[PDB]
Amino acid sequence: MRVFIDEIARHVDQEVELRGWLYQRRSKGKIHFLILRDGTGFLQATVVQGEVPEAVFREADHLPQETALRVWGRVREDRRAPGGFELAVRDLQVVSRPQGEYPIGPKEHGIDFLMDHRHLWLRHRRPFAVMRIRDELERAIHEFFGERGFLRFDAPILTPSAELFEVELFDGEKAYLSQSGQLYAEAGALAFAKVYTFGPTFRAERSKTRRHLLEFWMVEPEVAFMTHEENMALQEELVSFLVARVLERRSRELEMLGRDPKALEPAAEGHYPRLTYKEAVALVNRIAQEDPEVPPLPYGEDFGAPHEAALSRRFDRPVFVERYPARIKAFYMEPDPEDPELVLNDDLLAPEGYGEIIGGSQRIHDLELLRRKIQEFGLPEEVYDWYLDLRRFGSVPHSGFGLGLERTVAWICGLAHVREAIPFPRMYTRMRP
Amino acid sequence: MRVFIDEIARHVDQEVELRGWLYQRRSKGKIHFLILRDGTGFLQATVVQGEVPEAVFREADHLPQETALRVWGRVREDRRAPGGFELAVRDLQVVSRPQGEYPIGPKEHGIDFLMDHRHLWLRHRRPFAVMRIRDELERAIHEFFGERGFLRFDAPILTPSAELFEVELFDGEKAYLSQSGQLYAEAGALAFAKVYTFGPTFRAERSKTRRHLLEFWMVEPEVAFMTHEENMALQEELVSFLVARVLERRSRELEMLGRDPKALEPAAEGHYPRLTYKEAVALVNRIAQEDPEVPPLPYGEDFGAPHEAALSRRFDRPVFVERYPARIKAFYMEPDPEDPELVLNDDLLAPEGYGEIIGGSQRIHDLELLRRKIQEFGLPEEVYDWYLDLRRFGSVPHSGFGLGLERTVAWICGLAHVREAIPFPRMYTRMRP
Ligand SMILES: Nc1ncnc2c1ncn2[C@@H]1O[C@H](COP(=O)(O)OP(=O)(O)OP(=O)(O)O)[C@@H](O)[C@H]1O
Ligand SMILES: Nc1ncnc2c1ncn2[C@@H]1O[C@H](COP(=O)(O)OP(=O)(O)OP(=O)(O)O)[C@@H](O)[C@H]1O
Ligand SMILES: [Mg+2]
Ligand SMILES: [Mg+2]
Ligand SMILES: [Mg+2]
Ligand SMILES: [Mg+2]
Ligand SMILES: [Mg+2]
Ligand SMILES: [Mg+2]
C-alpha cells in the first residue's frame, strides 16, 4: 500500500510505496543513499546494487535534486538513520526530472534569493517545520475555542469608511482593508456570548522591521460580561495551551529548527508575570541605566520595540503589561475606576526579545461615555453609529484581544523575521511571488 | 455556578446563574413568562409573584426587549417548554435597559432594514442558527483535513499583478485582491503533499444574484499525485461528511430554520451522481423542452445559473458535472487523454436549485504544454514564471478544488441569498454595517 513518511514507523518490515521528490543523493560505489521527501517528512532510502534491477541502479546513479519519483521497498528499522527508519529500495520509477539547474542547490543562499524562490523554498526542511507548526496552531486555536463553546465569527475584510489600504470598488466608490475585526466581533459577542475572528488583516506600515507585515492573520476573541482581569486569564490560557500543543506534537519540527524546548516549557506552564504600565516603565528605565543600548522610556510615552524587547528578556515566559495611559490608547477602551487617566487594557509580551504577541482591553459599555470619547478623539460619530447601537441596545461589560499568528509562530519557531512564518509574505519591498 | 443555556440540561434541579438578554416577555397577572437569550440559546424563565422579592416582580412587569440582565434560579424539567427545560427565577438583576425603541421589534421587517441592522439582527433566532451551522462547518473542515494529514496553507490575499479589485499600496504601486489561492496552493501541494487554503477571496462581480458576494470564503484543497477521478472522490467525501456533521450536531439549528432534515440525509450518505458535460447538456435540453421557463443550452456554451438550478433539482443529492470543453475553461486545466477538446475538470452542483458549491480540476504537469497553453490564452508568461517553476522542478500530476463556504451554508440552511450566510456581507449595493 502507498504510505506517507509521516506514519512510516507503523509499517515496519512491510512492503510500502512512497511518492515524492529526491532531496539529497550520495552515490558511494555500489550503493546509493537517497533522502526522499514526500511532503510529510524526510526519509532515507538505500538503493543497493543486486537488490534492484540494473536499469534502476543506472538512473539512481545520475538522479538530480527535486526529481519526482515513485519508490517501492521494505521499511527497515535502522538505528543510524534520520528518525530511526529507512526504506530498502526494491524498485524505482522516475516521474519527472528538473528542466534546468534547481535554483536552491547545496550553497548558502541569501534571504532575498530564498524569498524570491519561496514557492520552491517551502519544500525545504526549515520552512517545512515552520508551516507545520503554523498548521498545528491553526487547528489548535479551533479546538481550543470549540471546546470552550466559542463561536468562530468571521469579521469583514472590506470595510466601508475611515494608515489603511484603500480598495477601488465600482463607479469611483472606495472601501478599505480591515486592520482589525474587533468592532464587528463585539457585535458577535453580544449575539453569541463568546466569539473569535480568525482571518487576515492589513496595515499600511512603512516599517521594514522584523515584526511587521502588510498582510497577516489575527485571532480576535471577544466575550460578553467578561472583565479586564478575566481577559488576561483567557489570554494566558490560550497562549500556554498553544505552546504546550506544539511541544507535545511538533517536537520533531522544533528540533529541525534547532529550537530549545526548554525555552518554551515555562510558557506552556502558565503563571505569566503581570506588570502595570507604571511598573513596566520603571523596570525599562532601570534596565536603561544598566545597559546604554537599551533606551529609556519617559512616563507617558508608548513602548517602542526595543523597550518591549529588553522588558521581555527579564522573564522566562510571556509577561502582561496592563493599565496604560488613556491618552495614548484607543477610544473604545474602558477607563480604570480608580484612576481616570488609565484604561483597563493589556499587552502580552513574548520572551527572548520578541515582545507583543497579544493586545487587548475591556470595552466601554456606557453609551454616553463612548459617545463622549468619540468626540474627544475627534472621530465622526456617523461612521460609528452601528457601533453605538451595541451600547444603545443590550449593552454589557465585555472584553477581548487580538493574537498575531505570525508573531506567535515566529516566537515559537525562534525566527529572525515574521515573513518566514507565513507561506507568501507581503512587506513594503516584497510582494512576490 | 454560572452556566450557559447551551448546556442547561446538565444542571437539572440545580441553582444556576444566567447572563444574557430578554428576547420575549409575556406578563399574565401574577406571573411573567420570560424568554432569555445568553448567546448560546433561548430559554424560558418564569418569574412568579411570591417566589421572588416584590421589587424584582415590579421591574419584570415593565422590562423591554434586549434588556441585559443576570438571572438566578433553579432549572426545572418542564415538558411543555422550548427545548424541554425552563428556569424558575428566584432573583433578577438588570444590567442595562435599551436607550430608545429596539429597532427589530415584533413586526415584519424587510430584508433591507434587517441587513441595515445586521449587527443587532445576528442576535435573533434565524441568523443565530445560521452562524452556528457556519461555525460547525468551519471546525468540521479543520477536523476533516487534519485527520487526513492535510496541512492548512494560507495563500496570500494581496497579489502582485493580473475583474479584480485593485489596492493602492505605496508611491503609486498597486496590488489586487485574490480571487483564488489555488496557484499558491499548488506550490504548497508540491511542498506538503496535501494542503488546503481557508481564507477570504474577492471577485468584482457586477451581479446582484442570490449566489454572489464581493467577499466570501473559499476552502481550496490541493494534493500531489492526485488524479481527476480521485479529486471528485475527495470532494464527495468532504461534502457528505460536512452535511452529516450538521445533521448530527446542529439538528436543533436546522429545526429553528424550518429545514427538513430529509432533504439533506441523501447528501450525507454519498453516492453522488456523475454526469459528463455532454450528458448534463442533454438533460438540461430535455428539461428545457418540458418546461419553457428553463432555457436550453447549446453544446459548447457554459452553464448559466438557471441551467444548474434545473439540473440540480433532478437529483436528491449533489451531482458532479465533468469534462467541460477546454475552450470555455482555464489554461491550467489538464486536457482529456481520450478527447483533446475536453479537460479533466468537475463542478459539484448542490440540489434544490442551489447549483455549484465546488469547482475543481486536474492541473497540467507538463512544462511545455502549460507554456503552450499560456500563450494560446494570450497570457503574459512573465507573471506565471514562478507558476512554471512548479512544472520545471519536481512536477507531478496534481488536482484540487475550491469549496464556497457561503454557498454550502446557504444550501444546508435553505437560505434564499448567500448574504444571510456570513456575519457582515459585502455586495454591489451593500457595504454596511
Ligand atoms: N503588521 C503586523 N504584522 C504582524 N502581526 C501584527 C502586525 N500588527 C499587529 N500584529 C499583531 O496583532 C496583535 C494585535 O494588534 P494590535 O493592534 O494590538 O497591535 P499593535 O499594538 O499595533 O502592534 P505593534 O505596535 O507591534 O505594531 C499584536 O499584538 C501583534 O501580535
Ligand atoms: N462570488 C462568490 N461568492 C461566493 N462563493 C463563490 C463566489 N464565486 C465562487 N464561489 C464559490 O467558490 C467555488 C469555486 O469558485 P469558481 O471560480 O470555481 O466558481 P465560479 O465559476 O466563479 O462560479 P459562478 O459561475 O457560480 O460564479 C464555487 O464552486 C462557489 O461555491
Ligand atoms: Mg502597529
Ligand atoms: Mg507596540
Ligand atoms: Mg496593542
Ligand atoms: Mg464567477
Ligand atoms: Mg460557473
Ligand atoms: Mg468553476
PDB file of N, CA and C in Angstrom, chain A residues 4 21 37-39 66 68 96 98-99 101 119 123 134-135 138 142 152 154 156-158 160 166 168 184 190 192-194 215 217 386 389 392-396 423 426 433, chain B residues 4 21 37-39 66 68 96 98-99 101 119 123 134-135 138 142 152 154 156-158 166 168 184 190 192-194 215 217 386 389 392-396 423 426 431 433:
ATOM      1  N   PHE A   4       2.701   7.459   3.722  1.00  0.00           N
ATOM      2  CA  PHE A   4       3.462   8.687   3.870  1.00  0.00           C
ATOM      3  C   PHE A   4       4.556   8.475   4.916  1.00  0.00           C
ATOM      4  N   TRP A  21       9.809  13.360  -3.807  1.00  0.00           N
ATOM      5  CA  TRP A  21      10.877  14.041  -4.519  1.00  0.00           C
ATOM      6  C   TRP A  21      12.219  13.687  -3.882  1.00  0.00           C
ATOM      7  N   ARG A  37      11.760  13.141   0.130  1.00  0.00           N
ATOM      8  CA  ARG A  37      10.708  13.886   0.801  1.00  0.00           C
ATOM      9  C   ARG A  37       9.405  13.586   0.067  1.00  0.00           C
ATOM     10  N   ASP A  38       8.313  13.409   0.822  1.00  0.00           N
ATOM     11  CA  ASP A  38       7.006  13.161   0.232  1.00  0.00           C
ATOM     12  C   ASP A  38       6.013  14.237   0.664  1.00  0.00           C
ATOM     13  N   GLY A  39       6.512  15.299   1.314  1.00  0.00           N
ATOM     14  CA  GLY A  39       5.679  16.399   1.770  1.00  0.00           C
ATOM     15  C   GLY A  39       5.236  16.240   3.224  1.00  0.00           C
ATOM     16  N   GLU A  66      15.253  17.290  -6.599  1.00  0.00           N
ATOM     17  CA  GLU A  66      13.853  17.550  -6.919  1.00  0.00           C
ATOM     18  C   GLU A  66      13.423  16.728  -8.134  1.00  0.00           C
ATOM     19  N   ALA A  68      10.976  14.094  -9.156  1.00  0.00           N
ATOM     20  CA  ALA A  68       9.749  13.435  -8.748  1.00  0.00           C
ATOM     21  C   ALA A  68       9.862  11.952  -9.079  1.00  0.00           C
ATOM     22  N   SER A  96       9.419  12.585 -12.981  1.00  0.00           N
ATOM     23  CA  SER A  96       9.804  13.863 -13.558  1.00  0.00           C
ATOM     24  C   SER A  96      11.240  14.209 -13.170  1.00  0.00           C
ATOM     25  N   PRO A  98      14.060  17.588 -13.274  1.00  0.00           N
ATOM     26  CA  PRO A  98      14.122  19.039 -13.416  1.00  0.00           C
ATOM     27  C   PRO A  98      14.598  19.511 -14.788  1.00  0.00           C
ATOM     28  N   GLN A  99      13.873  20.485 -15.355  1.00  0.00           N
ATOM     29  CA  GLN A  99      14.311  21.206 -16.539  1.00  0.00           C
ATOM     30  C   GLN A  99      15.197  22.370 -16.098  1.00  0.00           C
ATOM     31  N   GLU A 101      18.984  23.663 -13.846  1.00  0.00           N
ATOM     32  CA  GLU A 101      19.546  23.567 -12.510  1.00  0.00           C
ATOM     33  C   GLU A 101      18.474  23.990 -11.507  1.00  0.00           C
ATOM     34  N   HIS A 119       8.274  29.752  -3.405  1.00  0.00           N
ATOM     35  CA  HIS A 119       7.387  28.703  -3.883  1.00  0.00           C
ATOM     36  C   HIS A 119       8.111  27.362  -3.971  1.00  0.00           C
ATOM     37  N   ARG A 123       9.552  23.795   0.176  1.00  0.00           N
ATOM     38  CA  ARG A 123       9.764  22.357   0.122  1.00  0.00           C
ATOM     39  C   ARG A 123      10.853  21.927   1.103  1.00  0.00           C
ATOM     40  N   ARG A 134       2.792  26.090  12.125  1.00  0.00           N
ATOM     41  CA  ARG A 134       1.742  27.050  11.821  1.00  0.00           C
ATOM     42  C   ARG A 134       0.399  26.326  11.720  1.00  0.00           C
ATOM     43  N   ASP A 135       0.386  25.180  11.026  1.00  0.00           N
ATOM     44  CA  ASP A 135      -0.816  24.375  10.867  1.00  0.00           C
ATOM     45  C   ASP A 135      -1.323  23.910  12.234  1.00  0.00           C
ATOM     46  N   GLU A 138      -3.153  26.596  14.011  1.00  0.00           N
ATOM     47  CA  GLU A 138      -4.416  26.951  13.380  1.00  0.00           C
ATOM     48  C   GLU A 138      -5.499  25.943  13.765  1.00  0.00           C
ATOM     49  N   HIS A 142      -8.726  26.384  16.892  1.00  0.00           N
ATOM     50  CA  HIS A 142     -10.104  25.982  16.648  1.00  0.00           C
ATOM     51  C   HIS A 142     -10.583  25.027  17.738  1.00  0.00           C
ATOM     52  N   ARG A 152     -16.750  30.737  16.080  1.00  0.00           N
ATOM     53  CA  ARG A 152     -15.955  31.445  15.089  1.00  0.00           C
ATOM     54  C   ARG A 152     -16.868  32.425  14.358  1.00  0.00           C
ATOM     55  N   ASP A 154     -16.416  35.198  11.507  1.00  0.00           N
ATOM     56  CA  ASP A 154     -15.582  35.836  10.501  1.00  0.00           C
ATOM     57  C   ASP A 154     -16.037  37.278  10.304  1.00  0.00           C
ATOM     58  N   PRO A 156     -15.705  41.124   8.550  1.00  0.00           N
ATOM     59  CA  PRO A 156     -15.480  41.512   7.164  1.00  0.00           C
ATOM     60  C   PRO A 156     -14.087  42.084   6.928  1.00  0.00           C
ATOM     61  N   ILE A 157     -13.592  41.920   5.696  1.00  0.00           N
ATOM     62  CA  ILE A 157     -12.289  42.426   5.291  1.00  0.00           C
ATOM     63  C   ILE A 157     -12.475  43.796   4.644  1.00  0.00           C
ATOM     64  N   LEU A 158     -13.401  43.872   3.676  1.00  0.00           N
ATOM     65  CA  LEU A 158     -13.788  45.134   3.066  1.00  0.00           C
ATOM     66  C   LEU A 158     -14.610  45.938   4.067  1.00  0.00           C
ATOM     67  N   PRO A 160     -16.367  49.850   5.072  1.00  0.00           N
ATOM     68  CA  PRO A 160     -16.981  50.938   4.316  1.00  0.00           C
ATOM     69  C   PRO A 160     -16.209  52.257   4.304  1.00  0.00           C
ATOM     70  N   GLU A 166      -6.653  51.382   0.686  1.00  0.00           N
ATOM     71  CA  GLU A 166      -7.964  51.627   0.104  1.00  0.00           C
ATOM     72  C   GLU A 166      -8.123  50.776  -1.154  1.00  0.00           C
ATOM     73  N   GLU A 168     -10.332  50.163  -4.697  1.00  0.00           N
ATOM     74  CA  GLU A 168     -11.221  50.752  -5.684  1.00  0.00           C
ATOM     75  C   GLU A 168     -12.331  49.749  -5.992  1.00  0.00           C
ATOM     76  N   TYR A 184     -16.584  44.458  14.907  1.00  0.00           N
ATOM     77  CA  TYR A 184     -17.601  43.522  14.456  1.00  0.00           C
ATOM     78  C   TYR A 184     -17.708  42.350  15.430  1.00  0.00           C
ATOM     79  N   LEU A 190     -22.161  40.172  21.671  1.00  0.00           N
ATOM     80  CA  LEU A 190     -23.487  40.424  22.216  1.00  0.00           C
ATOM     81  C   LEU A 190     -24.522  39.507  21.565  1.00  0.00           C
ATOM     82  N   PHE A 192     -23.556  36.175  20.448  1.00  0.00           N
ATOM     83  CA  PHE A 192     -23.230  34.778  20.699  1.00  0.00           C
ATOM     84  C   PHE A 192     -22.368  34.587  21.948  1.00  0.00           C
ATOM     85  N   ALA A 193     -22.340  35.581  22.848  1.00  0.00           N
ATOM     86  CA  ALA A 193     -21.730  35.449  24.166  1.00  0.00           C
ATOM     87  C   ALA A 193     -20.203  35.431  24.082  1.00  0.00           C
ATOM     88  N   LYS A 194     -19.657  34.472  23.326  1.00  0.00           N
ATOM     89  CA  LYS A 194     -18.221  34.280  23.225  1.00  0.00           C
ATOM     90  C   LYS A 194     -17.866  33.900  21.789  1.00  0.00           C
ATOM     91  N   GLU A 215       0.276  42.265   5.409  1.00  0.00           N
ATOM     92  CA  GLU A 215      -0.801  41.290   5.451  1.00  0.00           C
ATOM     93  C   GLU A 215      -0.425  40.194   6.445  1.00  0.00           C
ATOM     94  N   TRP A 217      -2.382  37.479   9.865  1.00  0.00           N
ATOM     95  CA  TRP A 217      -3.587  36.850  10.383  1.00  0.00           C
ATOM     96  C   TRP A 217      -3.712  37.119  11.881  1.00  0.00           C
ATOM     97  N   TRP A 386     -23.501  52.351  14.163  1.00  0.00           N
ATOM     98  CA  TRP A 386     -23.819  50.948  14.380  1.00  0.00           C
ATOM     99  C   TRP A 386     -23.059  50.411  15.591  1.00  0.00           C
ATOM    100  N   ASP A 389     -24.914  51.434  18.556  1.00  0.00           N
ATOM    101  CA  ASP A 389     -26.116  50.638  18.758  1.00  0.00           C
ATOM    102  C   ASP A 389     -25.843  49.510  19.749  1.00  0.00           C
ATOM    103  N   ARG A 392     -26.473  51.272  22.839  1.00  0.00           N
ATOM    104  CA  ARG A 392     -27.872  51.656  22.956  1.00  0.00           C
ATOM    105  C   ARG A 392     -28.722  50.454  23.357  1.00  0.00           C
ATOM    106  N   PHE A 393     -28.507  49.314  22.690  1.00  0.00           N
ATOM    107  CA  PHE A 393     -29.377  48.159  22.849  1.00  0.00           C
ATOM    108  C   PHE A 393     -28.586  46.975  23.402  1.00  0.00           C
ATOM    109  N   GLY A 394     -28.886  46.596  24.649  1.00  0.00           N
ATOM    110  CA  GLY A 394     -28.369  45.371  25.241  1.00  0.00           C
ATOM    111  C   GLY A 394     -26.880  45.464  25.565  1.00  0.00           C
ATOM    112  N   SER A 395     -26.447  46.635  26.037  1.00  0.00           N
ATOM    113  CA  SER A 395     -25.051  46.844  26.377  1.00  0.00           C
ATOM    114  C   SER A 395     -24.702  46.048  27.631  1.00  0.00           C
ATOM    115  N   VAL A 396     -23.516  45.428  27.623  1.00  0.00           N
ATOM    116  CA  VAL A 396     -22.972  44.776  28.803  1.00  0.00           C
ATOM    117  C   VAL A 396     -21.469  45.030  28.827  1.00  0.00           C
ATOM    118  N   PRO A 423       3.256  31.447   4.447  1.00  0.00           N
ATOM    119  CA  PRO A 423       3.612  30.911   3.136  1.00  0.00           C
ATOM    120  C   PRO A 423       4.220  31.932   2.174  1.00  0.00           C
ATOM    121  N   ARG A 426       4.006  39.508   2.617  1.00  0.00           N
ATOM    122  CA  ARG A 426       3.767  40.754   1.905  1.00  0.00           C
ATOM    123  C   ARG A 426       4.272  41.919   2.754  1.00  0.00           C
ATOM    124  N   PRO A 433       6.799  35.895  -4.556  1.00  0.00           N
ATOM    125  CA  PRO A 433       5.845  35.559  -5.611  1.00  0.00           C
ATOM    126  C   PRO A 433       4.385  35.632  -5.172  1.00  0.00           C
TER     127      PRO A 433
ATOM    128  N   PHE B   4     -24.360  28.258  30.831  1.00  0.00           N
ATOM    129  CA  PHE B   4     -24.946  28.697  29.576  1.00  0.00           C
ATOM    130  C   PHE B   4     -26.151  27.815  29.254  1.00  0.00           C
ATOM    131  N   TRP B  21     -29.826  38.399  27.707  1.00  0.00           N
ATOM    132  CA  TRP B  21     -30.711  39.461  27.264  1.00  0.00           C
ATOM    133  C   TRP B  21     -32.143  38.938  27.197  1.00  0.00           C
ATOM    134  N   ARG B  37     -32.158  34.992  26.177  1.00  0.00           N
ATOM    135  CA  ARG B  37     -31.072  34.505  25.343  1.00  0.00           C
ATOM    136  C   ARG B  37     -29.765  34.875  26.034  1.00  0.00           C
ATOM    137  N   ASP B  38     -28.787  33.963  26.002  1.00  0.00           N
ATOM    138  CA  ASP B  38     -27.476  34.225  26.574  1.00  0.00           C
ATOM    139  C   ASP B  38     -26.394  34.097  25.504  1.00  0.00           C
ATOM    140  N   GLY B  39     -26.805  33.971  24.233  1.00  0.00           N
ATOM    141  CA  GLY B  39     -25.876  33.855  23.119  1.00  0.00           C
ATOM    142  C   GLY B  39     -25.587  32.403  22.738  1.00  0.00           C
ATOM    143  N   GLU B  66     -34.390  43.209  24.687  1.00  0.00           N
ATOM    144  CA  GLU B  66     -32.947  43.413  24.706  1.00  0.00           C
ATOM    145  C   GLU B  66     -32.528  44.162  25.971  1.00  0.00           C
ATOM    146  N   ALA B  68     -30.378  43.742  29.006  1.00  0.00           N
ATOM    147  CA  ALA B  68     -29.302  42.944  29.566  1.00  0.00           C
ATOM    148  C   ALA B  68     -29.587  42.703  31.043  1.00  0.00           C
ATOM    149  N   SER B  96     -28.670  46.451  32.011  1.00  0.00           N
ATOM    150  CA  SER B  96     -28.806  47.511  31.026  1.00  0.00           C
ATOM    151  C   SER B  96     -30.206  47.499  30.420  1.00  0.00           C
ATOM    152  N   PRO B  98     -32.539  49.282  27.106  1.00  0.00           N
ATOM    153  CA  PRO B  98     -32.383  49.953  25.819  1.00  0.00           C
ATOM    154  C   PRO B  98     -32.617  51.462  25.867  1.00  0.00           C
ATOM    155  N   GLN B  99     -31.700  52.221  25.251  1.00  0.00           N
ATOM    156  CA  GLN B  99     -31.889  53.644  25.012  1.00  0.00           C
ATOM    157  C   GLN B  99     -32.653  53.821  23.700  1.00  0.00           C
ATOM    158  N   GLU B 101     -36.427  52.824  21.294  1.00  0.00           N
ATOM    159  CA  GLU B 101     -37.144  51.657  20.810  1.00  0.00           C
ATOM    160  C   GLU B 101     -36.140  50.720  20.142  1.00  0.00           C
ATOM    161  N   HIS B 119     -25.975  44.009  12.727  1.00  0.00           N
ATOM    162  CA  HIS B 119     -25.213  43.922  13.964  1.00  0.00           C
ATOM    163  C   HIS B 119     -26.115  43.597  15.155  1.00  0.00           C
ATOM    164  N   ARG B 123     -28.448  38.669  16.631  1.00  0.00           N
ATOM    165  CA  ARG B 123     -28.869  38.207  17.946  1.00  0.00           C
ATOM    166  C   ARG B 123     -30.101  37.309  17.844  1.00  0.00           C
ATOM    167  N   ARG B 134     -22.600  27.646  10.463  1.00  0.00           N
ATOM    168  CA  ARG B 134     -21.396  28.137   9.812  1.00  0.00           C
ATOM    169  C   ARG B 134     -20.169  27.746  10.637  1.00  0.00           C
ATOM    170  N   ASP B 135     -20.255  27.940  11.960  1.00  0.00           N
ATOM    171  CA  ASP B 135     -19.174  27.594  12.873  1.00  0.00           C
ATOM    172  C   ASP B 135     -18.883  26.094  12.798  1.00  0.00           C
ATOM    173  N   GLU B 138     -16.865  25.235   9.813  1.00  0.00           N
ATOM    174  CA  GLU B 138     -15.509  25.766   9.856  1.00  0.00           C
ATOM    175  C   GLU B 138     -14.625  24.882  10.733  1.00  0.00           C
ATOM    176  N   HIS B 142     -11.684  21.740   9.402  1.00  0.00           N
ATOM    177  CA  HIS B 142     -10.364  21.617  10.001  1.00  0.00           C
ATOM    178  C   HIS B 142     -10.121  20.191  10.487  1.00  0.00           C
ATOM    179  N   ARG B 152      -3.040  22.950   6.535  1.00  0.00           N
ATOM    180  CA  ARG B 152      -3.624  24.238   6.204  1.00  0.00           C
ATOM    181  C   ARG B 152      -2.514  25.139   5.671  1.00  0.00           C
ATOM    182  N   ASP B 154      -2.303  28.854   4.214  1.00  0.00           N
ATOM    183  CA  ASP B 154      -2.917  30.140   3.933  1.00  0.00           C
ATOM    184  C   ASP B 154      -2.218  30.791   2.743  1.00  0.00           C
ATOM    185  N   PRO B 156      -1.787  33.915  -0.110  1.00  0.00           N
ATOM    186  CA  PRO B 156      -1.829  35.363   0.051  1.00  0.00           C
ATOM    187  C   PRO B 156      -3.104  35.992  -0.501  1.00  0.00           C
ATOM    188  N   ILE B 157      -3.492  37.128   0.091  1.00  0.00           N
ATOM    189  CA  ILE B 157      -4.667  37.878  -0.329  1.00  0.00           C
ATOM    190  C   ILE B 157      -4.222  38.966  -1.303  1.00  0.00           C
ATOM    191  N   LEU B 158      -3.210  39.745  -0.903  1.00  0.00           N
ATOM    192  CA  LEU B 158      -2.605  40.745  -1.769  1.00  0.00           C
ATOM    193  C   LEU B 158      -1.762  40.041  -2.829  1.00  0.00           C
ATOM    194  N   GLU B 166      -8.503  46.358  -7.207  1.00  0.00           N
ATOM    195  CA  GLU B 166      -7.119  46.783  -7.094  1.00  0.00           C
ATOM    196  C   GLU B 166      -6.946  47.587  -5.809  1.00  0.00           C
ATOM    197  N   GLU B 168      -4.490  50.278  -3.712  1.00  0.00           N
ATOM    198  CA  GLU B 168      -3.416  51.252  -3.795  1.00  0.00           C
ATOM    199  C   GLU B 168      -2.463  51.016  -2.628  1.00  0.00           C
ATOM    200  N   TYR B 184      -1.094  29.256  -5.599  1.00  0.00           N
ATOM    201  CA  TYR B 184      -0.183  29.160  -4.468  1.00  0.00           C
ATOM    202  C   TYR B 184      -0.347  27.814  -3.767  1.00  0.00           C
ATOM    203  N   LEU B 190       3.085  20.611  -3.787  1.00  0.00           N
ATOM    204  CA  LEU B 190       4.369  20.004  -4.102  1.00  0.00           C
ATOM    205  C   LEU B 190       5.318  20.108  -2.909  1.00  0.00           C
ATOM    206  N   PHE B 192       4.010  20.048   0.488  1.00  0.00           N
ATOM    207  CA  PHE B 192       3.462  19.338   1.635  1.00  0.00           C
ATOM    208  C   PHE B 192       2.472  18.241   1.239  1.00  0.00           C
ATOM    209  N   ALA B 193       2.503  17.792  -0.026  1.00  0.00           N
ATOM    210  CA  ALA B 193       1.762  16.619  -0.475  1.00  0.00           C
ATOM    211  C   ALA B 193       0.262  16.899  -0.570  1.00  0.00           C
ATOM    212  N   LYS B 194      -0.342  17.315   0.548  1.00  0.00           N
ATOM    213  CA  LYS B 194      -1.774  17.540   0.631  1.00  0.00           C
ATOM    214  C   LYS B 194      -2.040  18.764   1.505  1.00  0.00           C
ATOM    215  N   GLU B 215     -17.090  39.548  -1.405  1.00  0.00           N
ATOM    216  CA  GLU B 215     -16.174  38.995  -0.421  1.00  0.00           C
ATOM    217  C   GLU B 215     -16.799  37.726   0.151  1.00  0.00           C
ATOM    218  N   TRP B 217     -15.610  33.288   1.455  1.00  0.00           N
ATOM    219  CA  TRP B 217     -14.570  32.397   1.943  1.00  0.00           C
ATOM    220  C   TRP B 217     -14.550  31.119   1.110  1.00  0.00           C
ATOM    221  N   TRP B 386       6.946  31.852 -11.898  1.00  0.00           N
ATOM    222  CA  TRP B 386       7.028  31.086 -10.664  1.00  0.00           C
ATOM    223  C   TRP B 386       6.076  29.893 -10.715  1.00  0.00           C
ATOM    224  N   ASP B 389       7.747  27.270 -12.620  1.00  0.00           N
ATOM    225  CA  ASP B 389       8.793  26.608 -11.856  1.00  0.00           C
ATOM    226  C   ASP B 389       8.256  25.323 -11.229  1.00  0.00           C
ATOM    227  N   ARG B 392       8.827  23.049 -13.968  1.00  0.00           N
ATOM    228  CA  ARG B 392      10.248  22.867 -14.222  1.00  0.00           C
ATOM    229  C   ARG B 392      10.859  21.925 -13.188  1.00  0.00           C
ATOM    230  N   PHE B 393      10.541  22.147 -11.907  1.00  0.00           N
ATOM    231  CA  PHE B 393      11.215  21.450 -10.820  1.00  0.00           C
ATOM    232  C   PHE B 393      10.213  20.620 -10.021  1.00  0.00           C
ATOM    233  N   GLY B 394      10.337  19.292 -10.127  1.00  0.00           N
ATOM    234  CA  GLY B 394       9.571  18.364  -9.310  1.00  0.00           C
ATOM    235  C   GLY B 394       8.092  18.331  -9.689  1.00  0.00           C
ATOM    236  N   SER B 395       7.806  18.407 -10.994  1.00  0.00           N
ATOM    237  CA  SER B 395       6.433  18.369 -11.466  1.00  0.00           C
ATOM    238  C   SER B 395       5.860  16.968 -11.280  1.00  0.00           C
ATOM    239  N   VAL B 396       4.604  16.905 -10.832  1.00  0.00           N
ATOM    240  CA  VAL B 396       3.851  15.664 -10.756  1.00  0.00           C
ATOM    241  C   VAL B 396       2.407  15.979 -11.132  1.00  0.00           C
ATOM    242  N   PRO B 423     -21.515  36.753   8.569  1.00  0.00           N
ATOM    243  CA  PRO B 423     -21.815  37.798   9.545  1.00  0.00           C
ATOM    244  C   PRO B 423     -22.182  39.152   8.938  1.00  0.00           C
ATOM    245  N   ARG B 426     -20.895  41.588   1.864  1.00  0.00           N
ATOM    246  CA  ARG B 426     -20.414  42.673   1.022  1.00  0.00           C
ATOM    247  C   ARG B 426     -20.827  42.405  -0.424  1.00  0.00           C
ATOM    248  N   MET B 431     -22.430  47.539   1.618  1.00  0.00           N
ATOM    249  CA  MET B 431     -21.092  47.608   2.177  1.00  0.00           C
ATOM    250  C   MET B 431     -21.162  47.992   3.656  1.00  0.00           C
ATOM    251  N   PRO B 433     -23.505  47.184   7.698  1.00  0.00           N
ATOM    252  CA  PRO B 433     -22.516  47.872   8.524  1.00  0.00           C
ATOM    253  C   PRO B 433     -21.112  47.278   8.428  1.00  0.00           C
TER     254      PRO B 433
END
